[PDB]
Symmetry: C3
Subunit: 331 residues, 3 copies
């Protein structure tokens, strides 16, 4: 095996580890979906992942958690969110420069947070992306002269929501859109590609992703969010990530854990609305902060009943194998 082939296998695993799925075929499907959405964003995300995992190599990280894509998944998101929020337009080639620098900052953060979380056997999640992208989008802002960003400002008037005009078909379509919005992509076709890409590896992740996107869609219909965000998918990427993380991966899948995951989707969606109203004061977007906060507060949660079992971090692979491992360890 040529080492360059091994490295590209690593980057493909990284580009799908965002969905907690470690499978290069799902990675290539997700890359295809990104290119379907907008080739510029796909190029930016691939550059972000390449530089992130390369920096992980240079810093001489643990070689075990790079063949799992553990250091690339924070790069694809940095690239995609850097290039979806740039006001200069498409193929503004200069944007590739900070996308490099910030991509070199994901392993560092991913290391540091790890040492903070090691005391509680808790995963670093998508916090490294949040810190880096918040750093960039606040460092530059909308009025910057080299890398301006799209303007986000707090609501200043009561939204005009008419429940006569709700389109249920579009509202339903908010499920695959919510799945795809994790990567920044809103096209329903890329959402379908993502759902298929998850379903190839493990059905439970796909099921919990669909349930999470739906659950967030519903949670933002209770606090009367404007319908444009519902159709566009902005209210269903924190929810889906939280649902996947809590449902069957970090907890052995069980009906108790299933209800816990749905509750986590609720908490994550409401926290997403909160942080979106708060972080829009600075002009920042809610870039996968709510998922991180809700998943952390749902994994640190302590219970008595034996059904709610938190797998040791090393053992995690995917929900089916997690359940198989737990059943084996019971014997």
């Amino acid at each position: 095996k040529s080492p360059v082939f091994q490295f590209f296998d690593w980057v493909l695993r990284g580009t799908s580890q965002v969905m907690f799925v470690n499978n290069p075929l799902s990675g290539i499907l997700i890359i295809l979906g990104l290119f379907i959405q907008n080739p510029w964003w796909a190029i930016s995300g691939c550059l972000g992942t390449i530089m992130s995992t390369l920096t992980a190599l240079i810093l001489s990280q643990d070689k075990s958690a790079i063949a799992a894509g553990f250091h690339g998944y924070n790069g694809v998101l940095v690239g995609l969110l850097m290039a979806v929020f740039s006001d200069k337009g498409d193929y503004y080639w200069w944007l590739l420069l900070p996308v490099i620098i910030m991509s070199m900052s994901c392993p560092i953060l991913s290391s540091a947070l790890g040492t903070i979380f090691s005391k509680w056997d808790l995963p670093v999640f998508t916090l490294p992306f949040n810190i880096t992208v918040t750093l960039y989008l606040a460092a530059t802002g909308h009025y910057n002269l080299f890398f301006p960003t799209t303007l986000l400002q707090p609501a200043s008037a009561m939204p005009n929501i008419t429940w006569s005009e709700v389109q249920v078909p579009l509202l339903l379509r908010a499920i695959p859109v919510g799945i795809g919005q994790v990567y920044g992509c809103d096209n329903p076709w890329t959402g379908g590609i993502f759902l298929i890409a998850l379903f190839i590896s493990s059905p439970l992740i796909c099921l919990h992703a669909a349930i999470g996107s739906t659950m967030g869609m519903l949670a933002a219909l209770t606090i009367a969010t404007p319908f444009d965000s519902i159709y566009f998918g902005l209210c269903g990427f924190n929810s889906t990530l939280a649902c996947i993380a809590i449902g069957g991966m970090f907890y052995v899948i069980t009906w108790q854990t299933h209800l816990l995951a749905i509750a986590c989707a609720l908490f994550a969606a409401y926290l997403g609305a909160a942080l979106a109203n708060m972080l829009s004061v600075f002009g920042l977007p809610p870039c996968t902060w709510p998922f991180c906060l809700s998943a952390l507060t749902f994994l640190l949660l302590t219970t008595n009943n034996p059904a709610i079992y938190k797998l040791p971090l090393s053992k995690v692979t995917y929900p089916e194998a997690n359940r198989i491992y737990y059943l084996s360890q019971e014997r």
Copy 2:
């Protein structure tokens, strides 16, 4: 004993554990005070506590720390602050719905923060309420269409404070008002009810509450806060909570700890002014964040002199019994 009677004993203990006091008679007195202030807020707070402790049951928490009200005290505050900040008015029955949902989110947080703080033998304090109420009041905001909230905006002009017009009698009355404002209630009569309710169980908690409210009242007269907030009690609920927590409960009461508690009241009041000027940018209120921050930074504080002694968390009950325990353990 009928189990329903036991559960209502639990909820009464929870409705008074806000004042660090574990006594069902004080709970019933505080409930009476709430109903004296505004029956709508009392109903909302009782619903919040009921659902919070019920969720603690469902999550199968430690049955020991529910007969102490440990999971209800974060529900009464959520209900009261949800229903004091609702712009729709009194008896807007729909408000009971989110008050349920958020009340089901207090045990979860109270568990999670516990696992974060267990490494330092530090109590979770009122942080669960802060997170939940901040989440709600930022998720909805003042312009929301289903559950609007009262508008809070940063100061935009120099306040007009005339020291000729200070009314000392009202200013003095800011002490019981400051005691009552912990629950959101500002009527002086409910403040008196609260002071009596504390004094029934343990005099030291009442004394430190009065001292803390006074100390915050004074601390906000040094930075020239507008007098309306002073009379209304907004500058004396963080201070009183901090003074109670540091004075005789988590530290064995001693004159050294007494000065430490007064200093903590000072730090908490100034931090309250700071967070109120900062958190008002988003439209959020300073909902018992300053007390939490100051009490944490005063309990993590490390000293050499043997007088400043931090009780192990399990042993805490109330200041007099704390002192008795320390004297016994000295022998």
Copy 3:
């Protein structure tokens, strides 16, 4: 030795420990530089340090880490930043009052954060100053009536940067200015005094300070910061502090650690721009938050290669002695 002489030796060590340098001669040189800049700020800073270390005495802290100035360095910064941001002008004597109170709050915080960081063998850094000065500048604000502060507001229009008019000599002079801006002083002469004061004790700290100030100067020329801040030194005090902390002090100096320090200067400068655009919403300045955050995330960072070695906290003195200790321990 008269005890008052010992105490003034302590305060002189504290006034230079800001630059991670423990040498009373450097302390007296830095005091001289402060008096060269503006005598009012020097008086305020000396009062801050005196009261901070005095409070550390009263709280009966560890007598070992007061002859190193460990409790005074958070007081000089509180005084200097309190008195550089006061809108009332120079020799507004009333300002000395809160400068006392807040100076009595630095040991407390410095203790508390220590107990938080002890689990990770990480230094408390300049976080105590940040918390206290942010608390003050948000508690009072620009519209306060007793202690108003200078107005800081977010950018509302695209800056007009012309690269024809860049003055390279001034731009180069931004290096000593960046060194001096740690203490709030911008005069190039006080920057030179500071560079000399560092170079007296250990050349590596001076070298890393110059490199850090330069590296931040460059990092803020990439995101197109207005040139006034570049000349004035606002973009080079987080960078220099981070470079000193990571370069040779907390890591045994090596070329690997040198590149790590330069990368930390980059991350700290970009984070400084970010926090300055964010914290200016409240009206707060970026008071040595970026350095703290970047240095923490660069010390918690975990590597495999043996060159990147993190000294146990107790052993740290200065980079040359650190390297000598590491070489001795290798044998």
